[PDB]
Design a binder for this molecule. Structure first.
Ligand SMILES: CC(=O)NCc1ccc(C(C)=O)s1
Ligand SMILES: CC(=O)NCc1ccc(C(C)=O)s1
Lengths: 237, 300
């Protein structure tokens, strides 16, 4: 059934699984028309499909042209997400396909189940975890490739850079979720933390800075402080 | 008018005949039911006084033979049987009427209820859903499961209902996943109506058969089937106009006939609110929505 705290380690076993987050598929700016009505302008988005064990993010970029002439776009977006995930699985060799796909929003279950009826053996699951994957567009390099896109495109990123050479996937996932949670709670503060030291660079090909093990501890602690911080500032504690 | 005689009534039992029912006491001198309207299918059903577990009964059509009821003390139930010796049957029936040992099927002459509940039900088609071809009548009881329920265990004792499954390859065309799931007209009209049933009468007959078995026997899988066949129509944007008008009448008389105190277990809140208030057909079932709202506004 659903994925939660009790069965957290399942994400790092050796059954190939993917998380799908659809929260950045359909994105709009809302603006005033000349007549003073409100209208939306869609901007490019992406599907966030992540193998948590290996770090691979199959980022499918959703170009705004896919919404042209379509109605009910928030509902279409969940079905478009499902169609692209289905296409991805089908593109992959049988031995590389998800044994499970975990959707971060329950509204994706029926769209995905319906698009994956050809794959009765892939479990489509929800999760009770509040995962921060919506903050993926606060990763500069991911945001750039989405906004620059002029056509549908899929770009694979390792979201863990080279961390798995030094830490486990459990730990790399925990780092990733703390970074994203921080970025989601205060993007300016979070980014300041990540980049305050110009000597630690992001190697062109990676998403995050080349922190040493001890620098990550520091970074991770500061991200915690931030999330505690904004929590007070939010609730006054 | 036809007759279903009883050999005897050795055990105290509540006897149903269509939507009517009466108590018979252990060894009370009861020899059956007379004046049964020809032209309709009928069901004669039973609930023992000592074990209200297992309602059971027989669908039958008096035009298909001479049928009687005889308690079997080994199997412990009232069994329907066919009498092939037609003169023996006429002789038996006549004696029991003369001694007035039969109850009369008590139809009010204004009352089209039974017709309106069985307009599309046909005993020969009943034999297709309950398979036991050596008898012309069909046995159903509370516990019988459906073919679909058995996919999700004795196939001989199953209700072979048409498989309806909205998240199935049959229901969903490649490339129209969203369209076919949100508007089931393809599944209703092409897969089901054109493909399996052939016509809406057949669709209506299975839907009617499912309801009556749910109501008379509290057969759960039948209730699932009845609700599924409703929801398939209500969730289709493109339904022939005459089918919608007929559905409204079917459901109206079903809701009208349902026991007031059984509505909590026979009526699916989700399906009915969806069908009446959110579905493509939310405006098309005027009679049904009006009787539902005045009789079971709790459910909604
Ligand atoms: C679903 C899944 O994780 N499949 C395994 C991979 C397929 C392609 C990959 C790369 C490295 O491009 S990883
Ligand atoms: C044949 C089948 O499976 N469905 C169509 C039906 C028409 C009438 C039926 C009953 C039971 O009277 S069933």
């Amino acid at each position: 059934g659903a994925m939660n705290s009790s069965n957290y380690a399942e994400l790092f076993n050796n059954d190939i699984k993917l998380f799908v987050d659809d929260t950045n598929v359909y994105r709009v700016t809302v603006h005033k028309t000349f007549e003073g009505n409100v209208a939306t302008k869609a901007i490019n988005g992406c599907i966030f499909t992540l193998n948590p064990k290996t770090g691979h993010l199959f980022l499918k970029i959703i170009h705004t042209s896919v919404w042209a002439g379509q109605k009910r776009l928030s509902q279409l977006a969940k079905w478009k997400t499902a169609e692209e995930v289905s296409a991805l699985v089908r593109s992959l060799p049988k031995e590389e396909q998800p044994k499970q796909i975990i959707v971060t929003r329950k509204a994706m279950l029926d769209p995905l189940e319906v698009h994956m009826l050809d794959f009765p053996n892939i479990a489509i699951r929800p999760t009770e975890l509040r995962l921060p994957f919506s903050a993926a567009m606060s990763i500069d390099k991911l945001s750039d490739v989405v906004m620059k896109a002029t056509e549908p495109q899929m770009v694979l990123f390792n979201i863990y850079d080279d961390w798995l050479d030094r830490i486990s996937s459990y730990t790399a996932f925990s780092r990733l979720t703390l970074l994203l949670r921080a970025l989601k709670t205060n993007e300016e503060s979070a980014k300041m933390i990540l980049l305050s030291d110009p000597t630690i660079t992001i190697k062109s090909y990676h998403l995050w800075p080349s922190f040493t093990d001890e620098q990550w501890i520091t970074i991770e602690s500061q991200m915690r402080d931030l999330i505690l911080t904004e929590y007070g500032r939010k609730y006054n504690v | 008018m036809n007759t279903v005689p009883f050999t005897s009534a050795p055990i105290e039992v509540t006897i149903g005949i269509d939507q009517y029912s009466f108590n018979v006491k252990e060894n009370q001198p009861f020899h059956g039911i007379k004046d049964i309207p020809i032209g309709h299918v009928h069901v004669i059903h039973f609930q023992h006084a000592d074990n209200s577990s297992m309602r059971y009964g027989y669908w039958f059509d008096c035009r298909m033979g001479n049928f009687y009821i005889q308690y079997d003390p080994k199997d412990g139930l009232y069994k329907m049987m066919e009498e092939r010796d037609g003169a023996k049957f006429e002789n038996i029936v006549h004696n029991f009427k003369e001694r007035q040992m039969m109850v009369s099927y008590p139809k009010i002459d204004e009352d089209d209820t039974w017709y309106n509940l069985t307009e599309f039900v046909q005993m020969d088609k009943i034999r297709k859903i309950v398979r036991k071809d050596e008898n012309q009548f069909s046995y159903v009881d509370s516990s019988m499961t459906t073919v679909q329920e058995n996919e999700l265990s004795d196939p001989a004792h199953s209700l072979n209902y048409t498989v309806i499954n909205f998240k199935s390859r049959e229901a969903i065309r490649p490339g129209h996943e969203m369209e076919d799931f949100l508007d089931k007209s393809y599944y209703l009209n092409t897969v089901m109506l054109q493909g399996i049933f052939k016509n809406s009468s057949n669709y209506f007959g299975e839907l009617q058969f499912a309801f009556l078995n749910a109501m008379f026997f509290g057969n759960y899988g039948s209730s699932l089937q009845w609700h599924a066949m409703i929801e398939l129509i209500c969730s289709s944007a493109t339904v022939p106009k005459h089918m919608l008008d007929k559905l409204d009448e079917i459901l109206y008389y079903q809701i009208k006939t349902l026991p007031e105190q059984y509505s909590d277990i026979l009526l699916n809140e989700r399906v009915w609110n969806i069908c009446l208030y959110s579905s493509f057909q939310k405006n098309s079932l005027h009679n049904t929505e009006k009787i539902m709202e005045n009789k079971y506004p709790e459910l909604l």
